[PDB]
Amino acid sequence: EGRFVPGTPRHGFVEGTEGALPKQADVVVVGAGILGIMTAINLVERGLSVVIVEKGNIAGEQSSRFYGQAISYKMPDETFLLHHLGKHRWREMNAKVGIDTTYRTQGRVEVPLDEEDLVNVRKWIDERSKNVGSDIPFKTRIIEGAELNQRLRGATTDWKIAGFEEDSGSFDPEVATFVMAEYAKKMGVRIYTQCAARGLETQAGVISDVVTEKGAIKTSQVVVAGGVWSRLFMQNLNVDVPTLPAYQSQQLISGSPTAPGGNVALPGGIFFREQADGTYATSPRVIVALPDLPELNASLEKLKAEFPAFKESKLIDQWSGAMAIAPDENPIISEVKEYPGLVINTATGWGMTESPVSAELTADLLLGKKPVLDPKPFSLYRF
């Protein structure tokens, strides 16, 4: 609510395409969150017409409710490159749109929980450094002393060591996906809001239509990017998508001239991230019952105790978001053997970060192209 500011770039509303639902589209995308939008953009670049159908408003669910960090820290081999390349593409994004998405290369310091955690993060960095798997330089390393002290300036606790993802990204949920949606519209993606996809029709084993509440659109190619609803949508087509719900709370507070900047993660559940306008995202837990109102207030109190720079900061907004996560915590970016011409791009807790690459992979899978990354760890049939 209060985090969105009407009549500014933080308005948080992009209108759907006007007029009647088109009779045909080369690809129909279900869902106008980041995954549907980014996939649509990728497909239009390949010369295909794209229509997105969205049951509510553009970017109305996970893709405007996120914490806002783009990180590869601790990612397993299955998703490391998805994140590493995702960040690299986010670093190109303001230049690609020519409008500020709020993406910033910010840097992130995470103090380990204990000696065991420090052993584990050191091994993780060492192993990745020995085989990055990309020519994009890796910029994560352990820091101490002056460099650490500068990143944690004004901290009450004498923190001694941290993992520093120097090129961690930041993006703000009041802006990023909305800028991407407007860009998609400018590129010719047509996006119909208040327009739920109900199902499909087929002819001779080929998709013929996406059936919406506003009528049918002719197509033989479908991307399911329905966020938490992807399981439900696929169940109506007799296909099981294993996801389970997860929930996370978020807060936004006003800035301070003495706040340290950056992205910080500390023992005692202290997490904050400076937004592009100098406000700060924070929460009692940012990586998966929701915290109650006393816990949320207490989270701000311990933030302020650790960083007195925030003592006079005002609570701008406080909200919660629903995710849907696969059993192994990795995305589902997959063909569906039951429906040739249909692909799924969903089931991720890191979709903002991953989206530029999962969009490409989704399109590759749809079109039968040599895929950008190994698709096996994202298959629907891995469980």
Ligand SMILES: Cc1cc2nc3c(=O)[nH]c(=O)nc-3n(C[C@H](O)[C@H](O)[C@H](O)COP(=O)(O)OP(=O)(O)OC[C@H]3O[C@@H](n4cnc5c(N)ncnc54)[C@H](O)[C@@H]3O)c2cc1C
């Ligand atoms: C609280 C929270 C914090 C997060 N923090 C981060 C972070 O710091 N960094 C990061 O990278 N990621 C983060 N994530 C994850 C990221 O926000 C999601 O992975 C990503 O937004 C998912 O995008 P999506 O397009 O799949 O889903 P959504 O944005 O939820 O979009 C799916 C859309 O599909 C529509 N839809 C569903 N069914 C239908 C239908 N039948 N017909 C038409 N439309 C339909 C929905 O209305 C919705 O708009 C966070 C998520 C949450 C909830």
